[PDB]
Tab-separated table of C-alpha atoms in Angstrom:
chain	number	residue	atom	x	y	z
T	26	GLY	CA	0.000	0.000	0.000
T	27	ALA	CA	1.591	3.215	1.252
T	28	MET	CA	3.659	4.503	4.159
T	29	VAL	CA	5.147	7.701	5.566
T	30	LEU	CA	8.945	7.811	5.691
T	31	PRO	CA	10.460	8.780	9.059
T	32	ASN	CA	12.509	11.580	7.456
T	33	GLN	CA	9.305	12.836	5.810
T	34	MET	CA	7.570	12.874	9.184
T	35	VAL	CA	10.415	14.712	10.932
T	36	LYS	CA	10.603	17.349	8.208
T	37	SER	CA	6.868	17.974	8.599
T	38	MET	CA	7.617	18.931	12.222
T	39	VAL	CA	9.760	21.894	11.154
T	40	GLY	CA	8.434	25.166	12.512
T	41	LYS	CA	6.604	23.324	15.284
T	42	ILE	CA	7.328	22.359	18.899
T	43	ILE	CA	8.775	18.896	19.477
T	44	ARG	CA	9.978	16.830	22.438
T	45	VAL	CA	13.217	14.861	22.070
T	46	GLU	CA	14.762	12.098	24.157
T	47	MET	CA	18.544	11.822	23.770
T	48	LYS	CA	20.671	8.785	24.553
T	49	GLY	CA	23.230	10.808	26.508
T	50	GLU	CA	20.623	12.893	28.344
T	51	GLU	CA	18.370	12.068	31.307
T	52	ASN	CA	15.949	14.961	30.752
T	53	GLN	CA	14.031	15.606	27.531
T	54	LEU	CA	14.529	18.593	25.243
T	55	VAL	CA	11.539	20.650	24.145
T	56	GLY	CA	11.788	23.400	21.553
T	57	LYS	CA	10.944	24.688	18.094
T	58	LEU	CA	12.363	22.562	15.299
T	59	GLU	CA	14.159	25.057	13.057
T	60	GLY	CA	16.109	22.544	11.013
T	61	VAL	CA	16.852	18.875	10.416
T	62	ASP	CA	18.909	16.777	7.969
T	63	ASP	CA	18.897	13.204	6.651
T	64	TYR	CA	20.986	11.981	9.581
T	65	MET	CA	18.317	13.425	11.866
T	66	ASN	CA	20.618	16.038	13.373
T	67	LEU	CA	18.243	18.583	14.906
T	68	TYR	CA	18.429	22.341	15.354
T	69	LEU	CA	16.023	23.642	17.987
T	70	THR	CA	15.429	27.240	19.030
T	71	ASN	CA	13.763	28.563	22.186
T	72	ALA	CA	14.619	25.168	23.685
T	73	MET	CA	14.338	24.009	27.276
T	74	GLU	CA	15.281	20.946	29.286
T	75	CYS	CA	12.199	19.241	30.715
T	76	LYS	CA	11.140	16.243	32.792
T	77	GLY	CA	7.655	15.706	31.454
T	78	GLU	CA	5.700	18.921	31.914
T	79	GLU	CA	8.336	20.189	34.359
T	80	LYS	CA	10.855	22.749	33.081
T	81	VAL	CA	14.339	22.459	34.612
T	82	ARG	CA	16.641	24.544	32.377
T	83	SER	CA	16.341	27.196	29.656
T	84	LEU	CA	18.638	26.457	26.717
T	85	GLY	CA	17.693	28.650	23.765
T	86	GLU	CA	19.475	27.575	20.584
T	87	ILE	CA	20.841	24.014	20.537
T	88	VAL	CA	21.949	21.420	18.004
T	89	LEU	CA	21.238	17.748	18.725
T	90	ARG	CA	23.409	15.023	17.174
T	91	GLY	CA	21.270	12.657	15.109
T	92	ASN	CA	22.829	9.342	16.074
T	93	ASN	CA	22.180	10.172	19.732
T	94	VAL	CA	18.526	11.034	19.216
T	95	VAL	CA	16.327	8.268	20.624
T	96	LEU	CA	12.759	9.458	20.148
T	97	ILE	CA	11.070	12.523	18.627
T	98	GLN	CA	7.489	13.456	19.461
T	99	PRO	CA	5.423	16.369	18.138
T	100	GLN	CA	4.402	18.495	21.115
Y	13	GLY	CA	19.458	-21.760	-0.115
Y	14	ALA	CA	17.349	-18.710	0.717
Y	15	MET	CA	16.888	-16.152	3.478
Y	16	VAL	CA	14.720	-13.194	4.462
Y	17	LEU	CA	16.530	-9.858	4.702
Y	18	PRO	CA	15.996	-7.918	7.946
Y	19	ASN	CA	14.876	-4.807	6.030
Y	20	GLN	CA	12.419	-7.005	4.110
Y	21	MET	CA	11.032	-8.335	7.381
Y	22	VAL	CA	10.660	-4.880	8.945
Y	23	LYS	CA	8.897	-3.503	5.878
Y	24	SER	CA	6.420	-6.390	6.045
Y	25	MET	CA	5.472	-5.104	9.516
Y	26	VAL	CA	4.185	-1.807	8.109
Y	27	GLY	CA	0.538	-1.238	8.936
Y	28	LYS	CA	0.789	-3.626	11.879
Y	29	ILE	CA	1.464	-3.334	15.618
Y	30	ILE	CA	5.062	-3.811	16.738
Y	31	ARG	CA	7.009	-3.689	20.004
Y	32	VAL	CA	10.376	-1.908	20.036
Y	33	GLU	CA	13.213	-1.883	22.550
Y	34	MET	CA	15.416	1.221	22.339
Y	35	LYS	CA	18.965	1.554	23.624
Y	36	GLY	CA	18.262	4.866	25.355
Y	37	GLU	CA	14.908	3.752	26.781
Y	38	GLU	CA	14.052	1.521	29.751
Y	39	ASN	CA	10.444	0.871	28.702
Y	40	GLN	CA	9.380	-0.595	25.358
Y	41	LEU	CA	7.415	1.244	22.683
Y	42	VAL	CA	4.307	-0.341	21.198
Y	43	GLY	CA	2.459	1.151	18.248
Y	44	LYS	CA	1.425	0.925	14.612
Y	45	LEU	CA	4.348	0.954	12.203
Y	46	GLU	CA	3.450	3.665	9.689
Y	47	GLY	CA	6.864	3.988	8.096
Y	48	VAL	CA	10.447	2.750	8.060
Y	49	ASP	CA	13.618	3.357	6.012
Y	50	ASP	CA	16.839	1.485	5.221
Y	51	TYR	CA	18.522	2.794	8.368
Y	52	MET	CA	15.620	1.322	10.328
Y	53	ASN	CA	14.347	4.690	11.522
Y	54	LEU	CA	10.763	3.995	12.590
Y	55	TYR	CA	7.596	6.073	12.500
Y	56	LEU	CA	4.899	4.770	14.833
Y	57	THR	CA	1.390	6.120	15.327
Y	58	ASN	CA	-1.025	5.489	18.201
Y	59	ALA	CA	2.085	4.577	20.201
Y	60	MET	CA	2.421	3.903	23.909
Y	61	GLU	CA	5.221	3.255	26.370
Y	62	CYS	CA	4.911	-0.201	27.921
Y	63	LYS	CA	6.633	-2.538	30.369
Y	64	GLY	CA	5.516	-5.871	29.003
Y	65	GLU	CA	1.726	-5.912	28.928
Y	66	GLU	CA	1.635	-2.894	31.254
Y	67	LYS	CA	0.911	0.515	29.710
Y	68	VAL	CA	2.703	3.438	31.387
Y	69	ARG	CA	2.410	6.379	28.957
Y	70	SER	CA	0.386	7.342	25.874
Y	71	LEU	CA	2.592	8.822	23.154
Y	72	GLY	CA	0.666	8.988	19.887
Y	73	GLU	CA	2.932	9.844	16.957
Y	74	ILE	CA	6.659	9.220	17.469
Y	75	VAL	CA	9.786	8.756	15.375
Y	76	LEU	CA	12.449	6.320	16.591
Y	77	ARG	CA	16.085	6.747	15.524
Y	78	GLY	CA	17.308	3.619	13.748
Y	79	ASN	CA	20.781	3.330	15.233
Y	80	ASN	CA	19.230	3.348	18.709
Y	81	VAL	CA	16.721	0.611	17.947
Y	82	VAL	CA	17.764	-2.620	19.661
Y	83	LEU	CA	15.013	-5.115	18.895
Y	84	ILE	CA	11.766	-5.089	16.892
Y	85	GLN	CA	9.043	-7.668	17.459
Y	86	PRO	CA	5.706	-8.034	15.660
Y	87	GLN	CA	2.959	-7.712	18.263
F	1	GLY	CA	47.833	-15.987	3.574
F	2	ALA	CA	44.053	-16.228	3.885
F	3	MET	CA	41.252	-15.213	6.232
F	4	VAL	CA	37.499	-15.545	6.705
F	5	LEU	CA	35.542	-12.290	6.526
F	6	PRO	CA	33.162	-11.630	9.437
F	7	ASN	CA	30.219	-11.106	7.056
F	8	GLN	CA	31.119	-14.417	5.388
F	9	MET	CA	31.086	-16.143	8.766
F	10	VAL	CA	27.736	-14.651	9.803
F	11	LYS	CA	26.106	-15.608	6.510
F	12	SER	CA	27.287	-19.194	7.004
F	13	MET	CA	25.222	-19.212	10.220
F	14	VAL	CA	21.964	-18.716	8.310
F	15	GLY	CA	19.519	-21.536	8.919
F	16	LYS	CA	21.262	-22.400	12.182
F	17	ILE	CA	20.826	-21.508	15.861
F	18	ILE	CA	22.893	-18.600	17.162
F	19	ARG	CA	23.313	-16.719	20.443
F	20	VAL	CA	23.496	-12.916	20.335
F	21	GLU	CA	24.554	-10.350	22.917
F	22	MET	CA	23.057	-6.892	22.338
F	23	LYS	CA	24.387	-3.609	23.684
F	24	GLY	CA	20.968	-2.467	24.896
F	25	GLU	CA	20.018	-5.859	26.350
F	26	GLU	CA	21.063	-7.596	29.579
F	27	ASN	CA	19.939	-11.079	28.509
F	28	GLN	CA	21.122	-12.881	25.375
F	29	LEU	CA	18.941	-13.762	22.397
F	30	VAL	CA	18.928	-17.305	21.049
F	31	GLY	CA	17.140	-18.272	17.852
F	32	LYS	CA	17.324	-19.434	14.253
F	33	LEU	CA	19.119	-17.004	11.968
F	34	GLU	CA	16.712	-16.517	9.060
F	35	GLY	CA	18.389	-13.480	7.558
F	36	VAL	CA	21.261	-11.019	7.824
F	37	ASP	CA	22.638	-8.067	5.821
F	38	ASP	CA	25.972	-6.270	5.420
F	39	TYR	CA	25.264	-4.022	8.402
F	40	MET	CA	24.772	-7.183	10.451
F	41	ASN	CA	21.093	-6.528	11.104
F	42	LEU	CA	19.721	-9.922	12.137
F	43	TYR	CA	16.363	-11.606	11.639
F	44	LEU	CA	15.778	-14.488	14.040
F	45	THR	CA	12.784	-16.809	14.212
F	46	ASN	CA	11.693	-19.085	17.061
F	47	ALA	CA	13.760	-16.779	19.278
F	48	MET	CA	13.979	-16.670	23.055
F	49	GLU	CA	15.598	-14.478	25.678
F	50	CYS	CA	18.163	-16.424	27.698
F	51	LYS	CA	20.678	-16.015	30.515
F	52	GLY	CA	23.142	-18.720	29.604
F	53	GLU	CA	21.270	-22.012	29.404
F	54	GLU	CA	18.327	-20.465	31.269
F	55	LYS	CA	15.278	-19.433	29.226
F	56	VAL	CA	13.460	-16.339	30.527
F	57	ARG	CA	11.152	-15.211	27.690
F	58	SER	CA	9.745	-16.602	24.433
F	59	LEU	CA	9.986	-14.070	21.606
F	60	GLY	CA	9.332	-15.787	18.284
F	61	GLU	CA	10.164	-13.528	15.342
F	62	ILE	CA	12.508	-10.609	16.068
F	63	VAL	CA	14.781	-8.239	14.172
F	64	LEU	CA	18.030	-7.122	15.818
F	65	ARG	CA	19.656	-3.817	14.827
F	66	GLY	CA	23.188	-4.420	13.563
F	67	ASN	CA	24.981	-1.508	15.193
F	68	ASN	CA	23.689	-2.687	18.575
F	69	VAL	CA	24.857	-6.265	18.128
F	70	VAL	CA	27.892	-6.924	20.323
F	71	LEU	CA	28.732	-10.588	19.829
F	72	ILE	CA	27.350	-13.461	17.732
F	73	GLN	CA	28.087	-17.086	18.568
F	74	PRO	CA	26.965	-20.225	16.725
F	75	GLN	CA	24.934	-22.318	19.158
N	10	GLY	CA	8.917	27.533	3.804
N	11	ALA	CA	12.537	27.624	4.956
N	12	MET	CA	14.794	26.097	7.594
N	13	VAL	CA	18.352	26.244	8.913
N	14	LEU	CA	20.373	23.050	8.505
N	15	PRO	CA	22.091	21.766	11.663
N	16	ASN	CA	25.485	21.667	9.909
N	17	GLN	CA	24.889	25.265	8.788
N	18	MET	CA	24.163	26.275	12.372
N	19	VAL	CA	27.246	24.532	13.778
N	20	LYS	CA	29.520	26.095	11.170
N	21	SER	CA	28.182	29.534	12.112
N	22	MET	CA	29.513	28.859	15.631
N	23	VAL	CA	33.113	28.686	14.400
N	24	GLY	CA	35.310	31.272	16.072
N	25	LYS	CA	32.893	31.500	18.992
N	26	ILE	CA	32.553	29.877	22.423
N	27	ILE	CA	30.320	26.813	22.641
N	28	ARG	CA	29.251	24.320	25.310
N	29	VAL	CA	29.179	20.622	24.403
N	30	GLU	CA	27.651	17.612	26.129
N	31	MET	CA	29.313	14.309	25.201
N	32	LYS	CA	27.798	10.853	25.544
N	33	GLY	CA	30.904	9.416	27.202
N	34	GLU	CA	31.447	12.424	29.476
N	35	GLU	CA	29.699	13.498	32.690
N	36	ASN	CA	30.949	17.100	32.608
N	37	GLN	CA	30.423	19.522	29.721
N	38	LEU	CA	33.169	20.935	27.517
N	39	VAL	CA	33.392	24.676	26.943
N	40	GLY	CA	35.798	26.227	24.463
N	41	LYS	CA	36.362	28.092	21.217
N	42	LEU	CA	35.149	26.212	18.160
N	43	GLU	CA	38.131	26.267	15.796
N	44	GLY	CA	36.880	23.631	13.390
N	45	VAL	CA	34.073	21.231	12.537
N	46	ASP	CA	33.220	18.773	9.735
N	47	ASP	CA	30.088	17.167	8.279
N	48	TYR	CA	30.192	14.350	10.829
N	49	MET	CA	30.167	17.023	13.529
N	50	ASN	CA	33.635	16.169	14.806
N	51	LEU	CA	34.681	19.255	16.768
N	52	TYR	CA	38.030	20.931	17.348
N	53	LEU	CA	38.026	23.257	20.348
N	54	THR	CA	40.862	25.430	21.618
N	55	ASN	CA	41.270	27.062	25.032
N	56	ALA	CA	38.829	24.404	26.247
N	57	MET	CA	37.812	23.542	29.789
N	58	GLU	CA	35.718	20.903	31.511
N	59	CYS	CA	32.739	22.459	33.286
N	60	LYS	CA	29.691	21.547	35.361
N	61	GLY	CA	27.419	24.434	34.508
N	62	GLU	CA	29.218	27.656	35.378
N	63	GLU	CA	31.729	25.702	37.477
N	64	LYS	CA	35.165	25.035	35.968
N	65	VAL	CA	36.731	21.703	36.977
N	66	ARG	CA	39.615	21.119	34.531
N	67	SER	CA	41.654	23.105	31.996
N	68	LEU	CA	42.078	21.200	28.733
N	69	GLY	CA	43.387	23.535	26.042
N	70	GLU	CA	43.252	21.933	22.598
N	71	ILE	CA	40.871	18.979	22.204
N	72	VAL	CA	39.108	17.089	19.430
N	73	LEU	CA	35.609	15.735	20.085
N	74	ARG	CA	34.304	12.734	18.127
N	75	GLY	CA	31.111	13.656	16.286
N	76	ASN	CA	29.076	10.516	16.876
N	77	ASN	CA	29.590	10.962	20.622
N	78	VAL	CA	28.466	14.581	20.665
N	79	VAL	CA	25.019	14.852	22.249
N	80	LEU	CA	24.224	18.559	22.334
N	81	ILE	CA	25.958	21.763	21.202
N	82	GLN	CA	24.980	25.161	22.573
N	83	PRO	CA	26.400	28.581	21.682
N	84	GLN	CA	27.819	30.097	24.862
K	18	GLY	CA	56.750	11.547	7.378
K	19	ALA	CA	54.999	8.181	7.589
K	20	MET	CA	52.387	6.380	9.667
K	21	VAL	CA	50.705	2.999	10.052
K	22	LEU	CA	46.970	2.948	9.339
K	23	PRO	CA	44.793	1.356	12.041
K	24	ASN	CA	43.195	-1.019	9.508
K	25	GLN	CA	46.704	-1.988	8.366
K	26	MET	CA	47.678	-2.743	11.954
K	27	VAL	CA	44.567	-4.831	12.648
K	28	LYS	CA	45.023	-6.861	9.473
K	29	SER	CA	48.602	-7.634	10.518
K	30	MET	CA	47.118	-9.284	13.629
K	31	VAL	CA	45.318	-11.924	11.556
K	32	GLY	CA	46.395	-15.430	12.479
K	33	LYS	CA	47.550	-14.224	15.890
K	34	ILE	CA	46.051	-13.990	19.385
K	35	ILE	CA	44.437	-10.683	20.326
K	36	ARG	CA	42.586	-9.229	23.315
K	37	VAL	CA	39.457	-7.156	22.668
K	38	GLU	CA	37.443	-4.836	24.890
K	39	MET	CA	33.825	-4.404	23.769
K	40	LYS	CA	31.514	-1.541	24.675
K	41	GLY	CA	28.642	-3.859	25.590
K	42	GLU	CA	30.842	-6.328	27.482
K	43	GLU	CA	32.392	-6.165	30.962
K	44	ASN	CA	34.939	-8.940	30.366
K	45	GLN	CA	37.514	-8.966	27.566
K	46	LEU	CA	37.581	-11.419	24.672
K	47	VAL	CA	40.780	-13.279	23.846
K	48	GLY	CA	41.151	-15.446	20.762
K	49	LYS	CA	42.741	-16.030	17.376
K	50	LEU	CA	41.905	-13.354	14.829
K	51	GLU	CA	40.684	-15.308	11.800
K	52	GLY	CA	39.161	-12.393	9.935
K	53	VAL	CA	38.481	-8.663	9.944
K	54	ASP	CA	36.949	-6.072	7.587
K	55	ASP	CA	37.163	-2.307	7.048
K	56	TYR	CA	34.471	-1.653	9.650
K	57	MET	CA	36.622	-3.586	12.114
K	58	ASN	CA	34.111	-6.397	12.538
K	59	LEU	CA	36.159	-9.250	13.999
K	60	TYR	CA	35.964	-13.017	13.632
K	61	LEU	CA	37.781	-14.873	16.401
K	62	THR	CA	38.217	-18.619	16.800
K	63	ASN	CA	39.200	-20.586	19.907
K	64	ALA	CA	37.969	-17.544	21.840
K	65	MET	CA	37.452	-17.137	25.567
K	66	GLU	CA	36.035	-14.521	27.903
K	67	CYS	CA	38.704	-13.206	30.270
K	68	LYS	CA	39.229	-10.711	33.084
K	69	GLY	CA	42.906	-9.993	32.657
K	70	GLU	CA	44.789	-13.277	32.868
K	71	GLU	CA	41.720	-14.952	34.387
K	72	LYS	CA	39.589	-17.147	32.113
K	73	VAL	CA	35.852	-17.095	32.892
K	74	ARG	CA	34.126	-18.637	29.844
K	75	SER	CA	35.059	-20.692	26.774
K	76	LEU	CA	33.426	-19.328	23.623
K	77	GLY	CA	35.026	-20.902	20.561
K	78	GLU	CA	33.941	-19.171	17.356
K	79	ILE	CA	32.539	-15.644	17.735
K	80	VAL	CA	31.940	-12.570	15.599
K	81	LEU	CA	32.400	-9.134	17.178
K	82	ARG	CA	30.551	-6.106	15.780
K	83	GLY	CA	33.029	-3.421	14.739
K	84	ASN	CA	31.228	-0.334	15.995
K	85	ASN	CA	31.099	-1.897	19.464
K	86	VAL	CA	34.798	-2.718	19.577
K	87	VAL	CA	36.583	-0.340	21.948
K	88	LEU	CA	40.196	-1.488	22.015
K	89	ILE	CA	42.238	-4.221	20.306
K	90	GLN	CA	45.578	-5.381	21.679
K	91	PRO	CA	47.942	-8.013	20.269
K	92	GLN	CA	48.351	-10.716	22.905
M	17	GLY	CA	37.292	33.307	7.493
M	18	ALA	CA	39.241	30.107	8.124
M	19	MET	CA	39.159	27.035	10.348
M	20	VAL	CA	41.131	23.893	11.156
M	21	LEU	CA	39.385	20.618	10.328
M	22	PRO	CA	39.257	18.054	13.154
M	23	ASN	CA	40.828	15.368	10.935
M	24	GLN	CA	43.589	17.853	10.066
M	25	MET	CA	44.217	18.467	13.757
M	26	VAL	CA	44.322	14.760	14.636
M	27	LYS	CA	46.729	13.990	11.803
M	28	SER	CA	49.049	16.730	13.072
M	29	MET	CA	49.263	14.751	16.335
M	30	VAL	CA	50.892	11.777	14.601
M	31	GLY	CA	54.290	10.974	16.055
M	32	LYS	CA	53.365	12.726	19.295
M	33	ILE	CA	51.914	11.703	22.667
M	34	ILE	CA	48.151	12.023	23.066
M	35	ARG	CA	45.555	11.290	25.749
M	36	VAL	CA	42.299	9.613	24.703
M	37	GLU	CA	38.992	9.145	26.496
M	38	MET	CA	36.953	6.196	25.200
M	39	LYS	CA	33.220	5.690	25.604
M	40	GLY	CA	33.610	2.082	26.743
M	41	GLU	CA	36.557	2.813	29.046
M	42	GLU	CA	36.710	4.382	32.517
M	43	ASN	CA	40.444	5.150	32.415
M	44	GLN	CA	42.164	7.235	29.739
M	45	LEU	CA	44.695	5.929	27.231
M	46	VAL	CA	48.012	7.711	26.794
M	47	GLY	CA	50.480	6.804	24.067
M	48	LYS	CA	52.260	7.733	20.857
M	49	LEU	CA	49.920	8.254	17.925
M	50	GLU	CA	51.394	6.084	15.167
M	51	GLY	CA	48.406	6.163	12.852
M	52	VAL	CA	44.887	7.462	12.301
M	53	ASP	CA	42.240	7.348	9.544
M	54	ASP	CA	39.221	9.412	8.478
M	55	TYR	CA	36.934	7.533	10.863
M	56	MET	CA	39.319	8.517	13.653
M	57	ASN	CA	40.381	4.951	14.389
M	58	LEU	CA	43.639	5.338	16.315
M	59	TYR	CA	46.797	3.252	16.486
M	60	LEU	CA	48.904	4.000	19.554
M	61	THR	CA	52.256	2.501	20.503
M	62	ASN	CA	53.988	2.488	23.893
M	63	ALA	CA	50.504	3.047	25.325
M	64	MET	CA	49.369	2.968	28.934
M	65	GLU	CA	46.095	3.170	30.819
M	66	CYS	CA	45.992	6.236	33.064
M	67	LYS	CA	43.736	8.070	35.507
M	68	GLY	CA	45.045	11.585	35.109
M	69	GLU	CA	48.762	11.557	35.855
M	70	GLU	CA	48.421	8.131	37.492
M	71	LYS	CA	49.532	5.087	35.484
M	72	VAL	CA	47.488	1.926	36.117
M	73	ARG	CA	48.358	-0.472	33.264
M	74	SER	CA	51.013	-0.839	30.555
M	75	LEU	CA	49.472	-1.693	27.186
M	76	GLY	CA	52.053	-1.241	24.440
M	77	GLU	CA	50.484	-1.440	20.984
M	78	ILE	CA	46.721	-0.850	20.803
M	79	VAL	CA	44.104	0.094	18.228
M	80	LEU	CA	41.189	2.294	19.312
M	81	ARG	CA	37.875	2.170	17.430
M	82	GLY	CA	36.991	5.617	16.101
M	83	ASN	CA	33.275	5.678	16.837
M	84	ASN	CA	34.049	4.927	20.488
M	85	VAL	CA	36.602	7.706	20.845
M	86	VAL	CA	35.147	10.548	22.911
M	87	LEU	CA	37.942	13.085	23.268
M	88	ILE	CA	41.542	13.391	22.041
M	89	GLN	CA	44.024	15.743	23.682
M	90	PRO	CA	47.659	16.390	22.747
M	91	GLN	CA	49.794	15.491	25.757
């Protein structure tokens, strides 16, 4: 039939708020997805470190390494 | 003789429910496989975080990074 | 002189029972190797989770991500 | 619309101070980004190991392996 | 001047006994290097699991995944 | 302006003593860099395992897997 490619899905999240779980991070990152590439490297702006709905640190602009991204969820 | 390629097997799971164990995740992810690519990145919909048959969190749409996928099992 | 390539060795295990240690798994996986690719992704059938000769969980069909495979041993 | 590629963002940080969280490191690295490549390997100069605003070790010149970089933040 | 490439060094170890430290393994692997490829996947024969000079498990034939190899040392 | 590529920096360390932190290693490796490749695999000679300025084990010749290298520092 048909299916939606992961890269297609992630690109559709550009300009929107997403939540990301990183392998080398205990808290999740929440911010606006400003850019992404085929290796799933992510560039977030207005980002913050969160533990669920609890904010723990303001980060602003950050770049996440794709091979260390575990899960991405539209917010 | 003959053999079934892993990528072939994973693609056959599209449209069906699968259980995934991630390297940077202590609980498994269960959801409908809506899309996958050659690097085994996975796009699940109607997903949930589970510990066996026990549901712990509703997630909805999520994208799993292929190099952090450990095991995939048809549900 | 001569040598046996790892990929050559793994392919020779197809159709046979193997034991696999995964980076993101504390127990080993034992099952029939039904398929493998150049990135060492593995497709096992009739698989089970074991701790040595002790069976802890029946799994059936599973796909193991190659970059998270640590060691493969013919059973 | 438009978006900023992660690699584009990281390159724009060259010549400036950045903070980096590594997967195999408990403390962050802070230093001047002197060079970077497409795999996000990083070359920092005048670097130091920090825990937030707390300096714990002087490092000087160091090269960080891209696949072990977790997060990069302009300082 | 000149230098010896890592892959060149590893290939020179073929046919000889080596000690390997794996990322997803607490004990080292010691065995005869029967084969290796450019991704540093390793095929050892007559292998054993060791903790220094202490043998803990006999393994025989095993294939080690290159990206999970940490250190290789001629024995 | 201009910048120094990480691979360029690492190659300039050939023939000199470097300190390396590995992801799957708790102690650092210190030795003479005899060879390196584009994936940052490293071949050290006269190497030793250290904890800062404290020597804990003599290693001699060792090959470090590039994707498990975390940080490299000229000694």
